[PDB]
Amino acid sequence: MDRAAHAVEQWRSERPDLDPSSMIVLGRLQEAALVIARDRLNPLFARYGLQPGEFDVLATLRRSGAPYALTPTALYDAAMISSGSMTNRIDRLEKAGWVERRATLVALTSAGRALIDDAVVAHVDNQRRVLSALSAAEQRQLAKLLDKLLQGQ
Amino acid sequence: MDRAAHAVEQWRSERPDLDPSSMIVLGRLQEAALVIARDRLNPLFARYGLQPGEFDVLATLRRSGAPYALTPTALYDAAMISSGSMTNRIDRLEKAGWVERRATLVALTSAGRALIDDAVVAHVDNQRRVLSALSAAEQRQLAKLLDKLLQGQ
Ligand SMILES: O=c1[nH]c(=O)c2nc[nH]c2[nH]1
Ligand SMILES: O=c1[nH]c(=O)c2nc[nH]c2[nH]1
Numbered sequence: 001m002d003r004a005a006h007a008v009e010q011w012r013s014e015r016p017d018l019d020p021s022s023m024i025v026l027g028r029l030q031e032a033a034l035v036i037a038r039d040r041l042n043p044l045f046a047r048y049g050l051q052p053g054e055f056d057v058l059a060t061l062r063r064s065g066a067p068y069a070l071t072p073t074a075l076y077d078a079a080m081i082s083s084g085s086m087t088n089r090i091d092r093l094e095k096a097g098w099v100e101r102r103a104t105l106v107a108l109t110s111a112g113r114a115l116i117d118d119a120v121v122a123h124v125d126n127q128r129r130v131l132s133a134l135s136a137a138e139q140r141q142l143a144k145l146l147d148k149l150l151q152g153q
Numbered sequence: 154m155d156r157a158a159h160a161v162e163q164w165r166s167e168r169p170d171l172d173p174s175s176m177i178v179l180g181r182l183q184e185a186a187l188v189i190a191r192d193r194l195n196p197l198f199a200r201y202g203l204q205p206g207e208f209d210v211l212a213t214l215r216r217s218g219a220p221y222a223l224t225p226t227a228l229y230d231a232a233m234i235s236s237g238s239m240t241n242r243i244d245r246l247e248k249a250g251w252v253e254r255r256a257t258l259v260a261l262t263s264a265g266r267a268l269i270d271d272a273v274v275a276h277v278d279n280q281r282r283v284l285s286a287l288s289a290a291e292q293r294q295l296a297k298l299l300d301k302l303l304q305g306q
Contacts, residue, residue, distance in 0.1 A: 002300060002303060002304075003231075003232065003233055003234070003235070004233060006231070007212075007213075007216060007231070007233050010216035010217065010218075010231075011216050011273075013218075014215065014216050014218060015216075015270075015273065018273065018274065018277055019277060019281075020277055022277055022280035022281050022283075022284055022292075023233070023277070023280065024296045025284060025292050025293075025295050025296040025299065026189070026194075026280055026283065026284070027233045027234065028296055028299035028300055028303060029182070029185060029186055029189070029295075029299055030186050030189075030190065030233075030234055031233070031234050031235065031303060032182060032186075032299050032302055032303050032306075033182055033183050033185075033186035033187070034186070034234060034235065034236060035235065035303065035306055036179070036182070036183075036306065037183065039306065040306070041179075059160075060160075062167065063160060063163035063164050063167050063168075064163065065163075065166075065167060078156075078159070078160070078163075079156065080156055080157060080160050080176070080180045080183075080184070081156070081180065081183055081184050081187060082156070082184065082187065082188065083187060117168075120164075120168065120171065121171065124171055124172060124173055124175055124176070127175035127176065127179055128172075128175050130175075130179065130305075130306070131175055131178060131179070131302070131305075132305065133301055133302060133304065133305025134298065134301060134302060134305070138298055138301070139175075139178050140178075141294070141298060142178050142182075142295070142298040142299075142302070143177045143178040143181055145287065145291055145294060145295040145298070146178065146181035146182055146185050146295075147155060147181055148286055148287060148291070149185055149284070149286060149287060149295070150155060150181060150184060150185050150188065151155075151286065152283075152284075152285065152286025152287070153185075153188055153189065153192065153193070153283070
């Protein structure tokens, strides 16, 4: 029994008037996102000098194609994750030398392009090791259920 | 196409040397956790005066049973989510009048017990509305895949 199943068990015993079934799927969803970010993905980003969220900025710029420059709005719309503090992240990346602000565009530098080209290869190998417990069918199955849940919001 | 599928499409076109398939399931996992916390669960907690993470503390204490008092270590082990800043959350909850520090235990006050008894009922109704796009079988299916992924870590 994991955190979520144990908690549901305690709730059934303590508040029998309650149907706490929904707590398992949502508790596991949030714990999986947290543990994977904290223990797997972010330590790899930090090996590359990237704080959480900064990889996404560079990745979005890189995969938009040459000249790897987007408006801050397009950067938010094309991000993998709709996380905030985008102005702070661009500022940090600029002082680090990986993006520059042109005209108003945010663009990879040569150094930033080189970094993300390196980091994305390490990132996808890391992701496959994160998902290796699930078979290919289970991974597609999990992607489909997550897409339905997301659209339901 | 969602954020994740669109990003994978751009990657296949820009770095054909890369297999970016893993990005869909993990991108959807993190976006679903984020959107559900930000747009669904946390606004409900804030209706009750609870910041993100504080509900979990009260919920853990309440479901441990009378006298609703745990060591800070037990509080971390029994939490639904292994999130940090537990000392800060206990401090906040203490100044708010919902927990007290006894002997070293953290315990619900009368006011804190009443609050969590009210909030947990609202919380589970909110969770069912969050999950309503998925059928009962899909929800169990999603809980099983998430459990396998978590154990794989
Ligand atoms: O293109 C991307 N792929 C990812 O896996 C990712 N994670 C955060 N930001 C990201 N961008
Ligand atoms: O018992 C609990 N049930 C939940 O759904 C939850 N979410 C955060 N913390 C929680 N504790």
